[PDB]
A paper describes a structure:
Human UHRF1 (huUHRF1; ubiquitin-like containing PHD and RING finger domains 1), also called ICBP90, is a multi-domain nuclear protein associated with cellular proliferation and epigenetic regulation. huUHRF1 contains a plant homeodomain or PHD finger (huUHRF1-PHD) that was shown to be necessary in the opening of dense chromocenter structures, possibly through its chromatin-binding ability. We proved that huUHRF1-PHD is a histone H3 reader that shows preference for unmethylated versus trimethylated H3K4. In this work we show that the PHD finger of human UHRF1 represents a new mode of histone H3 recognition that requires the appendage of an additional zinc finger, relies mainly on the recognition of H3R2, and shows preference for unmethylated H3K4, although it can accommodate H3K4me3 without compromising the complex formation.
To determine the molecular basis of histone recognition, we solved the crystal structure of hUHRF1-PHD296–367 in complex with the unmodified histone H3 peptide at 1.95 Å resolution. As predicted from the protein sequence, the structure consists of a canonical PHD finger (residues 318–363) preceded by an additional zinc finger (residues 296–317). The additional zinc finger involves the residues C302, C305, C313 and C316, which are strictly conserved across the UHRF1 family, and delimits the H3K4 binding site, as detailed below. The histone peptide binds in a shallow groove on the protein surface, and only five out its eight residues were clearly observed in the electron density maps. The peptide does not adopt an extended β-strand conformation as was observed in the structures of AIRE1 or BHC80, but instead it folds in a bent conformation with a sharp turn of nearly 90° at the position of H3K4, which projects its carbonyl group outwards. huUHRF1-PHD296–367 accommodates the side chains of H3K4 and H3R2 simultaneously in two adjacent binding surfaces that are separated by the side chain of a conserved methionine (M332). The side chain of H3K4 sits in a broad flat open surface, with the ε-amino group making hydrogen bonds with the side chain of Q330, with the carbonyl oxygen of C316 and with a water molecule that simultaneously binds to the side chain of Q330. The N-terminal amino group of H3A1 is hydrogen bonded to the carbonyl oxygen atoms of P353 and E355. On the other hand, the backbone carbonyl oxygen of H3R2 is hydrogen bonded to the amino group of M332, while its side chain sits in a pocket adjacent to the H3K4 binding site, with the guanidinium group interacting with the carboxylates of the invariant residues D334 and D337.
Author numbering:
A (entry chain D): 1 to 5
B (entry chain B): 300 to 365
C-alpha cells in the first residue's frame, strides 16, 4: 500500500 | 496555504490533509493513502487497526471500498 511516507 | 481547512498549522488537527480519522500528522510512514480518494489513514486508527502496512499494492479506505 502507498503511505504518506 | 496548501490546505485551506487548517492553513497548514502543524499544531492543528486536520482530517483533510492529515489522518482522516484522527487528524494527526505524526507517523506519515504509517499513514495509508487511499487509492480512490487519496485521504490518509494511520494503520492504528483503522477499525480494525493494522499492526503493519499492508504489502498488497492497492488499498482503499473504509469509505471508498466494497
Ligand atoms: Cl476543517
Ligand atoms: Cl470524505
Ligand atoms: Zn489541513
Ligand atoms: Zn490517525
Ligand atoms: Zn478513500
Ligand atoms: Zn470522510
Amino acid at each position: 500500500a502507498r503511505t504518506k511516507q | 496555504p496548501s490546505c485551506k481547512h487548517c492553513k497548514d498549522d502543524v499544531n492543528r488537527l486536520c482530517r483533510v490533509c492529515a489522518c482522516h480519522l484522527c487528524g494527526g500528522r505524526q507517523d506519515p510512514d504509517k499513514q495509508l493513502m487511499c487509492d480512490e480518494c487519496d485521504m490518509a489513514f494511520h494503520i492504528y486508527c483503522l477499525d480494525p487497526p493494522l499492526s503493519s502496512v499492508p504489502s498488497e499494492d492497492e488499498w482503499y479506505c473504509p469509505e471508498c471500498r466494497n
